[PDB]
């Protein structure tokens, strides 16, 4: 997902070639950036 | 924004028995999220308690405002800081501990003065160097300027690279106020405004009861 | 637009304003998964080389931007040039297990060594900077007030000993080089480009031949 | 038999940037969790966009405070990304790992006087190929915004990009075409008792802003 | 022609731990049969959970007599794998082979004493940040339990696991966050007529232990 | 929980008695086909080689957990830094075979050599420890009664000579390396940290680079 | 099954990567471990 560019799958497993990530239970400044008032305050003439 | 010679941009906070009112608001800055994230994980093996009668203000003076500072002029403010009250005692019942901070700042003289104050909530603040300060506004922070407003509320959650913390070896926020554009007081400002801070802990947690003196 | 300065809600006008029109953008370079993903050349220690990330020069594309973050998270490769086998031992490890071949060892095959290395430290989370100490049997650290000097104390400080991704040795090691894997950064903190004397900083940049 | 295979001369070699992973050595390793943390960024320009940094003017300072004289130039430097007003910028100091850009560059100017201190000004994109304007009257012809002071402090203005080519550099060599893009003019039209008074300037990535071709210079 | 193939730098040099397998040269073997083998394990964690192998005290003993004076502190060590105190257990021995560890470490007290020989006692967990309880009454604000001798000789108590990050060190090396985790506190508080008795002490994996990345470093 | 002490039927209790909550392990790695599943340097004789699993040091990853098992089953591979060519040969074999060619004999290729094998012993299982003879002429094995001293008479017993997974010969055998394959293990066995001078066992731990 | 991580299949035959094992007609531990008492042997209050 970064700068990788195989179009075939590792000969290795998942489990071998990273870390696993565990859950418990872009993201802010995305949406930050999208939340931006883009118009205009005043009226507009013409 | 609202209203002749001064204005109804008006806010109440409350964190606990406690309240502010301004009348000069301008809103408030949520930094890096919405809510905190889990609060009880595998860390404190179930045994972390919340403990709501420490989540009210408690106020400190940070500086003053004079006309001689100049841009660049900061006052940094670790938190936590020293506290005399029942959050300051938790921090000595308790091993490990975890909070965000509902922060408030003032600096009141009146719309006769000029310059400009940036407020910001720093993460692991160890150095800053001068440059530096041209991008403070990458972290929360919101301005006081004169001629619109009086206070600055920012509002943050806890954040670190372990989910709770000891506080007695790190601080993981660092309040600061800097001069952006020096002080101006003409002949009507005020001749200078001392800066305030009214700061709540929120979401406070705490994990590891300690021994007394006993 | 007119807005309020002192708000810090973001406002990003367009030239739509004035009658121009806002054009696609394709921002796949400034992804941070893939800038990060590239090797970047540390001066190695001869024998053991502890994994850090902050040995990265402050000044390189990976230095740079690793430093314009406060907690990061990825995993590891290194590509390493040496004499004898090298060992690799994860976060935790005693120094002296350096020296034991069961831990992943791997033998001389030139030109250099390339190995995929999991994330090993303790914590959910690392940090370029942090503002506080790992020793315990000292005295607490005080609640610092006052401007920019008061920062001064924080100097002599080492980042905490649980942040590294473990250590490696060999009989010499010449060439390191480190590569973020799936990369993840959180709080931006300034990123500072050079600084002209000149109205303008102007460099020789790479144009043809004659 | 086996299968036969030719291996191929000038294939092979490590490369710094290359797209191909290392073999692993040690499994099955399970991370603590880290889902919901506060802050996160994917894409740097998300951040350059939601947050601008302020400009440097003469001094070391970030504004410019409003003469009372004639001369009604508050500022006037090149549309480079290598602008000494632009170096202490979020903006300049991603820039400097790129060595190319397009799109939308937007300025903010908040005025800081008090209630009693009122002002107009001016600011126009300068194209190359020309002297910049030195007097508002001259630079009424380009592509400008006036504004005046009241309730809201701020005034946001999206410079457009506008060359030749479709994309231009990052750095900057000796005044070039895909180098140098003309000036940004901050003028002052009057003032009202605003004398002494600082405006300050920011800036941030718009919102069709590019950055392209990863570079590593030496540099920070 | 025959397929192109790219033989990769960097890549296969024998690792002391990948995950690949050797070529086979010696085919066709069928062993004697040994399905079911008693005493088969698995997991080194069940037997370290299903066997509390014992402490040991001053004196190279496992147990810790009930004293007859003021003292009463029958015992004070660091919640550390590499104690003195622990370094007798199968689980320190299993620890050592590990770089981290999580969860629950459970201690077994078992009375020894005559039927005419009654005791209370008291084991609390002292986290790090300030200095161990030296009496019972300091220590009841820890995590703590009382017990006291009858029918049942033995008594078994969870120590938490809390500590700042997820995960903690097995090994030690001057007293650090990552490393030492604070103090187990055995004390009496009384006793009628035990005035010699041993009371002796066990230690077993509680059901969230975990120990994880394996490291080989000299030691046994 | 209070519980009958003599009875020797596991008692675990968890943080829940006084209002804790026990969470989720991952215990991949104190898995025994995983972590005997490594390799583990021997010292090689020059010539001739038994393979024995006995010969790697106790104090090892490999070594403490092998003699932490009474009986164990596991295949083989080996990798063998030698001169000339290396022959191994089955369990059983006359030594003098060690010179034959058909058997098992690989060819010289820098830098190692890396061979699976079987389990070759005529035995269900193999012991890391076994309280007998295996030379019949003899007098019988006495039926010992005492306390410690008693098995001082045994300590120039050497391991039946049926326990082994063959031999290999090669003209010089520089490095010997065994990595178990699919290991079973049964009966535990003690397992011994380093005993501490002090309250606790300290070591430099791998710490970031200053 | 213990440490190996590769996704394709082995290009030898299991005859000759391992011995191949035979029948006639965890396990003791873990049965061991499960089998202990978690509980409370007192009458609880509060």
């Known amino acids: 997902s970064g700068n990788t560019g195989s179009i075939i799958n590792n000969y290795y497993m998942q489990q071998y070639q990273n870390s696993m990530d565990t859950q418990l239970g872009n993201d802010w400044f995305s949406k930050l950036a999208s939340s931006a008032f883009s118009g205009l305050f005043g009226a507009l003439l013409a | 924004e609202e209203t002749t010679l001064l204005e109804d941009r008006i806010l109440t906070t409350r964190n606990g028995h406690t309240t502010s009112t301004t009348q000069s608001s301008v809103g408030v ?22 403990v709501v009668q420490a989540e009210r203000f408690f106020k400190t003076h940070l500086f003053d405002w004079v006309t001689s500072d100049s841009f660049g002029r900061c006052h940094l403010l670790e938190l936590p800081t020293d506290h005399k009250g029942v959050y300051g005692s938790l921090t000595d019942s308790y091993a490990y501990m975890r909070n965000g901070w509902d922060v408030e700042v ?50 943050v959650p806890f954040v670190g690279v372990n989910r709770y913390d000891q506080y007695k070896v790190h601080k993981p926020w660092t309040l600061v106020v800097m001069v952006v554009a020096p002080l101006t007081v003409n002949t009507e400002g005020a001749p200078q405004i001392k800066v305030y801070a009214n700061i709540a802990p929120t979401n406070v947690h705490v994990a590891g009861e300690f021994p007394s003196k006993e | 637009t007119t807005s309020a300065g002192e708000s810090a809600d973001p406002v990003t006008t367009t030239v739509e304003n004035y009658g121009g029109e806002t054009q696609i953008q394709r921002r796949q370079h400034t992804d941070v998964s893939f800038i990060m993903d590239r090797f970047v050349k540390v001066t190695p220690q001869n024998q053991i080389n502890i994994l850090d990330l902050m040995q990265v020069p402050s000044h390189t594309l990976v230095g740079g931007l690793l430093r314009a973050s406060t907690y990061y998270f990825s995993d590891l490769e290194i590509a390493v040039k040496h004499e004898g086998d090298l060992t690799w031992v994860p976060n935790g490890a005693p120094e002296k297990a350096l020296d034991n071949t069961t831990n992943p060892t ?37 609640n610092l007030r006052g401007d920019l000097q008061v920062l001064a104390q924080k100097v002599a400080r080492t980042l905490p000993t649980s942040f590294n991704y473990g250590a490696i040795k060999a009989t010499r090691v010449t060439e390191l080089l480190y590569r973020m894997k799936r990369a993840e950064t959180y709080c931006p903190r300034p990123l500072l480009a050079i600084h002209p004397t000149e109205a303008r900083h102007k460099q020789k940049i790479v144009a043809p031949v004659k | 038999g086996i299968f036969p295979v030719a291996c191929s001369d000038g294939y092979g070699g490590l490369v710094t940037t290359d797209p191909k992973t290392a073999d692993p050595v040690y499994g099955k390793v399970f991370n603590p969790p880290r889902n919901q943390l506060p802050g996160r960024f994917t894409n740097l320009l998300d951040v350059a966009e939601a947050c601008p940094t302020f400009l440097r003017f003469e001094g070391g300072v970030p504004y410019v405070t409003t003469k009372t004289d004639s001369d009604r130039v508050l500022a006037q430097f090149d549309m ?12 300049a100091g991603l820039a400097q790992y790129y060595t190319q850009y397009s799109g939308t560059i937007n300025l903010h100017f908040m005025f800081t006087g008090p209630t009693d201190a009122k002002a107009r000004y001016m600011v126009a994109y300068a194209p190359p190929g020309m002297e910049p304007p030195k007097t508002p009257e001259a630079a009424a012809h380009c592509i400008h915004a006036e504004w005046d002071t009241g309730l809201n402090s701020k005034f946001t203005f999206s410079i457009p990009y506008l060359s030749a080519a479709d994309y231009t550099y990052t750095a900057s060599d000796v005044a070039e075409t895909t180098n140098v893009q003309g000036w940004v003019c901050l003028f002052q039209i009057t003032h009202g008792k605003a004398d002494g008074d600082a405006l300050v300037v920011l800036a941030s990535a718009g919102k069709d802003f590019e950055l392209r071709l990863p570079v590593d210079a030496r540099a920070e």
């Open chain 2, 29 to 50: 800055t949520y930094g890096y999220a919405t809510a905190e994230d889990f609060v009880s994980g595998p860390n404190t093996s179930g045994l972390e308690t919340r």
């Open chain 2, 106 to 155: 003032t600096a009141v003289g009146n719309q006769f003065n000029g310059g400009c104050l940036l407020v910001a909530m720093v993460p692991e603040l160890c150095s800053i160097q001068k440059r530096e300060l041209y991008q403070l506004t990458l972290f929360p922070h919101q301005f006081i300027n004169p001629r619109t407003n009086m206070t600055a509320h920012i509002t």
């Open chain 3, 106 to 142: 791997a033998y001389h095959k030139a030109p250099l060594t390339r190995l995929a290395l999991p994330y090993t430290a303790p914590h959910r989370v690392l940090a370029t900077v942090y503002n506080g100490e790992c020793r315990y049997s000292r005295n607490a650290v005080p």
């Open chain 4, 80 to 91: 480079s990304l290598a602008a000494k007003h632009m170096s202490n910028t979020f903006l």
